[PDB]
From a paper:
We identify a cryptic RNA-binding unit that recognises RNA with high-sequence specificity and show that this non-canonical RNA-binding domain is responsible for hEXO recognition in Syncrip-mediated exosomal miRNA partitioning.
In order to investigate the non-canonical N-terminal RNA-binding region of Syncrip and to provide a structural framework for our studies, we set out to determine the structure of the N-terminal region of the conserved N-terminal ‘acidic’ and RRM1 domains (NeR1 construct) in Human and Drosophila Syncrip proteins. The Drosophila protein crystallised in space group P21 with two copies in the asymmetric unit. The 2.2 Å resolution X-ray structure was solved by single-wavelength anomalous diffraction (SAD) using a seleno-methionine derivatised protein. Finally, we observed that two high-confidence and five candidate RNA-bound peptides mapped to the amino (N)-terminal region of Syncrip, overlapping with the ‘acidic’ domain that has previously been described as a putative protein-interaction unit. The presence of multiple high-confidence RNA-bound peptides in this region indicates it likely plays a role in the interaction with target RNAs in the cell. This indicates that the N-terminal ‘acidic’ domain, although specific to Syncrip protein, contains patterns of short sequences often associated with RNA-binding sites in other proteins. We also show that the domain is functionally and physically coupled by a structural element to a second RNA-binding region comprising the RRM domains, and that the coordinated interaction of multiple Syncrip RNA-binding domains is the basis of efficient recognition of the full-length miRNA.
Numbering used by the authors:
A (entry chain B): 22 to 104, 122 to 243
B (entry chain A): 22 to 105, 121 to 243
Amino acid sequence: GERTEDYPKLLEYGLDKKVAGKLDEIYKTGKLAHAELDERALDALKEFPVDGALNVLGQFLESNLEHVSNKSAYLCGVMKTYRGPDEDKIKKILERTGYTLDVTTGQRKYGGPPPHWEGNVPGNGCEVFCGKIPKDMYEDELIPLFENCGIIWDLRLMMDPMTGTNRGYAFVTFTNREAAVNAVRQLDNHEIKPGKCLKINISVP
Amino acid sequence: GERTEDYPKLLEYGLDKKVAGKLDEIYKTGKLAHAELDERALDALKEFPVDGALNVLGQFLESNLEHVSNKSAYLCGVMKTYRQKGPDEDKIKKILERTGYTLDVTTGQRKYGGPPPHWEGNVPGNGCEVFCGKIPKDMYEDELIPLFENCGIIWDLRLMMDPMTGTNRGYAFVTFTNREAAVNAVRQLDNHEIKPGKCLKINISVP
């Protein structure tokens, strides 16, 4: 295909030809729209060393952007840093619970709130910390694990915007305190992977 | 031992002394309070022959009254049945604790959730419900709930009961929070051998 209508706009703005061509490729993919890239974001991109900019746009184009409700703010997140899971397991999980999945540069959030949730959030009394998570793991394996403890209100897997893997920990909020305590009691020191034991702590002792 | 302060109140109401005696004995056990039974239930009891009234009270005494919110309606249910056992409570306690769901027991039904805690908006409805048949008559929701929990999120579960026997009628309805879960339950659990030689019959409520 030919260049998009916004290609010469990028060039006029003073972007390096190579950087402008890469961003335009992103435009034609549909990952991003030119109408949602502010002059601030373009300036930041312009301030990048050329091969730096190419890598950032390269990482953006070659990343799983499914369930990313804000592609623009995501790219900006990638830029600040430089400055996925089994899709069919995920699909089946989201279908059967109806829960939202939202991915940002530093987090993959499952639910929070669940569909049709009434009243206040459970809070931190119903929340547990889950540390020492194997970096290769995602919520497709974490969610079924914690579902046995009770009803997940949310699950937030913290992500490394650079490495692409998780930061090795997550928070899980259940709909009540007893489920949280249940998770601590039964899943602390759980060998989720050969040689890899999780660390589960109640957020509010 | 001595009789409760509600014993003479029963006698004043015109209850046969023998019937009032047995009812007051039920009061003592804590399974029932005089405040719980309303006049409609007592009148129905008074119309009963003494031999009949005594056995209605006997069946009530022997009933699993755990999680029965409406004792009056339960007593009336036994009476209407006459003119014609339970879950592992440690399992139930754990389930109810981790989910926070209500459990309500009537003479003809054991109901889990419906609605769940903190449910806002539209009920899932019949489109998200499955029929579960050929349930072994000795099975209760302590075993049925963990089975259907793997399929999706249970909005409610209604195990139908035989007021005559106190065992189930061999079928239940399960409503999930969406239809994908319901369809999932049908696909994965139809003909599920829940006990050796006993396979469940799961049908979507709305084909």
